[PDB]
């Protein structure tokens, strides 16, 4: 069922290998485990904040 | 796709009492919510639609309202016929999602069950396996469990269970709990026992047998 790719150094652009990473973001009606970073800002000194 | 949370998972109330069940949506759903009532063996009936509109053929006892994001469903006075599972549906953004659903119990006097043990028989053991069965009959409330012991040690990971629906007049039910052993494992243990625990049992029912017995 499986076959290797003909990934030759002589292949044109449409036949070159490309790496793909897909970042899938899952949101359920549940506590969000991937959480915590409520937007933060930089410190500013010697001014009213 | 708005998800629903329905609460409490179960409510107990006597006949004539006022019952409130609430539903909360993860997002805005306008006034798209429907309220369903389901009896054992029957299709869910519609009680309320579009948050506050009563369905025809539904007793006036069924009503509801909204405050902020909290949707409240009320039975002004429970009748013996209202002990049913209830559900919320939000028909706003598709796919349309329903909540988990909740139950209402009658608050009958609490009592322990008739408990029988069926030690694996010679005929059952012909399969090459063994099945130990503890059956709790005709008891109340809905919540009960069986803890098994093998050679007086607590057992775990070697059992299965099934529970029935509550009786139309007394709301009692039976509980079936079993152990699965290969025949070879049955032969390695001398004492088997069923420990029954629940709210109506002041002292856990313990029944036991020796391997090869009955």
């Amino acid at each position: 069922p499986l076959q290797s790719y003909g990934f030759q150094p002589t292949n044109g652009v449409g036949y070159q290998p490309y790496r793909v990473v897909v970042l899938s973001f899952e949101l359920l009606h549940a506590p969000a485990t991937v959480c915590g970073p409520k937007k933060s800002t930089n410190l500013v000194k010697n001014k009213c904040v | 796709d708005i998800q629903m949370t329905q609460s409490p998972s179960s409510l107990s109330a006597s006949v004539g009492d006022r019952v409130t069940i609430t539903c909360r949506a993860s997002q805005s759903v306008s006034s798209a919510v429907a309220w369903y009532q389901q009896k054992p063996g029957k299709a869910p009936k519609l009680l309320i639609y579009s948050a506050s509109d009563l369905y025809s053929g539904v007793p006036s006892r069924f009503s509801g309202s909204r405050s902020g994001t909290d949707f409240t469903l009320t039975i002004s006075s429970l009748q013996p016929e209202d002990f049913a599972t209830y559900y919320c549906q939000q028909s706003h953004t598709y796919p349309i999602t329903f909540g988990q659903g909740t139950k209402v119990e009658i608050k009958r006097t609490v009592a322990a069950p008739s408990v029988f043990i069926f030690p694996p028989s010679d005929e059952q053991l012909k399969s090459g396996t063994a099945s130990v069965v503890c059956l709790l009959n005709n008891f109340y409330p809905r919540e009960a469990k069986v803890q098994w012991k093998v050679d007086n040690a607590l057992q775990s990971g070697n059992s299965q269970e099934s529970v029935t629906e509550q009786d139309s007049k007394d709301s009692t039910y039976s509980l079936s709990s079993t152990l699965t052993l290969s025949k070879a494992d049955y032969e390695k243990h001398k004492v088997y026992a069923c420990e029954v625990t629940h709210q109506g049992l002041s002292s856990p029912v313990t029944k036991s047998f020796n391997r090869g017995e009955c």
Binding site: - | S31, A34, S50, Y94, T164
Partner: protein, 223 residues
Amino acid sequence: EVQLVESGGGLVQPGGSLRLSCAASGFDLGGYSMHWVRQAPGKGLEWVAGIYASGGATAYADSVKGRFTISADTSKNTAYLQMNSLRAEDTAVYYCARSYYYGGFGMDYWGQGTLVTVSSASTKGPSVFPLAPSSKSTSGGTAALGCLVKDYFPEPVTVSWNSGALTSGVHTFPAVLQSSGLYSLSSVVTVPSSSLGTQTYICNVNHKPSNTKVDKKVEPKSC
């Protein structure tokens, strides 16, 4: 008088298709949307599809998209669901319902629902295994004989005692689906214990879907 009548359910094997219909009476379809809702055995409810009768526009649950098609006919005052590419994961009671606008309003009225079942074991008639009473003293002086109804498909089955003559003291379980691809349920009869050696206790399992029945005599065993 407003009525919704569903029809057309039945048993369809994986790779096939099933057409469901629902007639409306007492009201028109025009100005209303029509919907189908699915309830798998042992589960809560999930929506499948909706159509606006006066527009022809539809929406589908993402989970059924590409397989479940919804339509309506205002001349006949009826509506349909065409379920294709069926799998054993699509077995459910299918309900017809009506509502206002595309959404933002709840459903007013549902039909009763028609059941479709599928399994690795497409059908089987039941068999019954007996369950012995305790030989020891009991609360109230009562006791029971029971049995296990096993390996049949599809559900429902009707289970009763003494060939159907005994309903008093009878308590039964809903069936659940086992790893065999078939359904099973236990059953008991509780009477004063001396009656277990006097009365007849034959489990009568009636399974209309396979055209069979089981007559199984349950008796006390030496113990």
